[PDB]
From a paper:
Here we report the discovery of type IV borosin natural product pathways (termed ‘split borosins’), featuring an iteratively acting α-N-methyltransferase and separate precursor peptide substrate from the metal-respiring bacterium Shewanella oneidensis. The α-N-methyltransferase SonM from Shewanella oneidensis MR-1 iteratively methylates its substrate SonA at two residues, SonA-L63 and SonA-I65, in an N-to-C terminal fashion on the core peptide. Complexes of SonM and SonA form dimers of heterodimers. A five helical bundle at the N-terminus of SonA, now referred to as the borosin binding domain (BBD; 1–53), serves as the SonA leader peptide and is homologous to a portion of the fused clasp region of OphMA.
Among the mutations targeting residues directly interacting with the core peptide, SonM-Y93F shows the smallest changes in catalytic efficiency, as compared to the wt enzyme. However, the mutant exhibits the largest change in the apparent KM value for SAM (220 μM, a 3.8-fold increase as compared to wt). While, globally, the SonM-Y93F mutant structure complex does not reveal significant differences to wt, the structural observation that mutation of SonM-Y93 incurs a conformational change upon SAH binding is consistent with the increased apparent KM value and a role in binding SAM. Consequently, the cofactor cavity is significantly larger, and the ability of SonM-Y93 to switch between an inward trajectory towards the cofactor and outwards towards solvent and suggests a role in cofactor binding and release. This structural data corroborates the increase in the apparent KM of SAM for the SonM-Y93F mutant.
Numbering used by the authors:
A (entry chain C), C (entry chain A): 2 to 263
B (entry chain D): 4 to 71
D (entry chain B): 3 to 71
């Protein structure tokens, strides 16, 4: 057996790569994690042999640590590979961007002597640069998981575009709830106030999943984040608080000044 | 609904027709007045209900920030 | 006339999105910036009405500021839109990731009253996560243009995966040469030594463009960067110099500790 | 020939997986010469361009700068 992990992009049917679609089409079995029922239908018409990985998330109010969800997803994928199936894992977005299941399945498959690889896809961050007309190169880019920003020591560069992913669960330390609380997001606000003013405009972004749907682009002061409506798919964009300033130290080592830049 | 969305999402000629005239394209693909109204008001939950996936839960979080 | 900017990704033919390929196919005219002759051939078979933007780069040893090259690309795209053509700009990778031409063309077209948009594509960073088996969410990600890192004030977080893009022209201040010098890379090494040891393992990465080609994944100590062989497409990956450490201040405000983390 | 093969292989997951099982057998069956196959096996992209009819295609791929606006 063998494993190829693909992404489907955020948009229905059209944001998958030509090659990745061909992998789904020719697979013996597909393990899916897709945004909605339109997407699920589209997959099932491409290849009817689908196991839905959604089933491994907490059902009906049960307490389940997401680390157990992800292990159960990895194990399901590997059982098909160990049985001899030409296996594809089809995840939304990019299969290895803020997504542990495909890297862990690939590490495990390789360790057991199976062919396994990952095909890049279009992630929610890719959709953001296009939707907001922002280039990450313009003043630089930083990405962190929102809860990892709160739990561990991270220092943002306030000249960059800063992304906090999974902002809807920011501070949710148990990994058993589907959303955080207003008071947790107020603590993140106070933490961010080390670098960003309380009236600094931030953007709640959600990439569209359907071709008739507009993306969510909600501008608001940082101070209003804790009252904002968030969903599991929401990303927080924090645009630069400061303009770029000349690095006179490095310019002097290069023997040049600002006037010399082309 | 699902047939229309899946064609529209993949076909750049139909996408450009749609953007010119959303209601005329949706009507020409048989969408009901209530489906069209769900599109124009951005009501994604109503569209899912109207498609008969009324009862399919979907959590998209595939990573955590706790390490190890 | 109208504008749509698409990406073709890094790999020949298979790494464009299904919808982006359909935009190229139905275009009145395509302005291309593609990696090689195989990709150019592929495009020309999809749509024969192609203007190759490569012509706007300095030819035959002429001194030309890349700002003038980019302006001339934007102007050639807009002339087609203004004439009334259904115009597609097909760039490699993602059309708005370390790529100013599509954002500038979309800004100018909107300001002149034309319809303009950007479709996301698969960039070289999206290929890197797949080829190295690294999730940018694992300890977070930072991207800068290498020269901007030297010329302006940027502070990396050394717990993250740091990317310096366009490392081959690091410190080339004129925007008129195609490569930098070993002396300029040695100044970058000394600058980076504020956060990274001289023996810190870094990675020179190049995404493959052909299906028969393996990516370049060259591991070397940071100290050896100035003697390395770089190409215009080379990206420098600098993996974390430090492990994640517990943010006691925020954890206390949350009322939790390390032992509480799920 | 060289171009037709690479374009199919890049798009077709069935051929891609045939190729990965047996690169030389797949290449030979799609008419590649021994020199084309040797260029693939040694990772010599420059020579592959020549055998395709390059006609010195020049390909600079930098579409941004770090000097600010």
């Amino acid at each position: 057996g063998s494993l190829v992990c693909v992404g489907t992009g955020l948009q229905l049917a059209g944001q998958i790569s030509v090659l990745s679609r061909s992998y789904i089409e020719h697979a013996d079995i597909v393990f899916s994690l897709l945004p909605d029922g339109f997407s699920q239908r589209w997959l099932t018409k491409l290849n009817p042999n689908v196991i839905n990985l959604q089933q491994f998330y907490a059902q009906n109010g049960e307490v389940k640590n997401r680390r157990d969800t992800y292990e159960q997803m990895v194990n399901a994928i590997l059982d098909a590979v160990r049985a001899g199936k030409k296996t594809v894992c089809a995840l939304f977005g990019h299969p290895g961007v803020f997504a542990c299941v495909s890297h862990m399945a690939i590490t495990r498959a390789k360790a057991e002597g199976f062919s396994a690889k990952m095909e890049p896809g279009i992630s929610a961050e890719a959709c953001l640069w296009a939707d907001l007309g922002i280039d990450p190169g313009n003043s630089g880019h930083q990405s962190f998981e929102a809860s990892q920003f709160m739990f561990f020591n991270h220092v943002p560069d306030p000249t960059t575009h800063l992304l906090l992913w999974q902002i809807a669960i920011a501070g949710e330390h148990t990994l058993t709830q589907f959303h955080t609380s207003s008071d947790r997001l107020q603590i993140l606000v106070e933490q961010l106030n080390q670098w960003y003013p309380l009236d600094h405009e931030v953007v709640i972004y959600e990439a569209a999943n359907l071709p008739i749907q507009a993306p969510r682009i909600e501008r608001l002061p940082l101070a209003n984040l804790p009252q904002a409506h968030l969903m599991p798919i929401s990303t927080l964009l924090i645009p630069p608080a400061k303009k770029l300033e000349y690095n006179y130290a490095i310019l002097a080592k290069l023997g040049i000044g600002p006037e010399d830049l082309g | 609904l699902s047939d229309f969305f899946t064609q529209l999402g993949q076909d750049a000629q139909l996408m450009e027709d749609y953007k010119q005239n959303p209601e005329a394209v949706m009507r020409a693909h048989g969408l009901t007045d209530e489906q069209i109204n769900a599109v124009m008001t951005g009501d994604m939950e109503k569209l899912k209900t109207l498609s008969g996936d009324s009862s399919y839960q979907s959590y998209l979080v595939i990573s955590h920030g706790n390490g190890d």
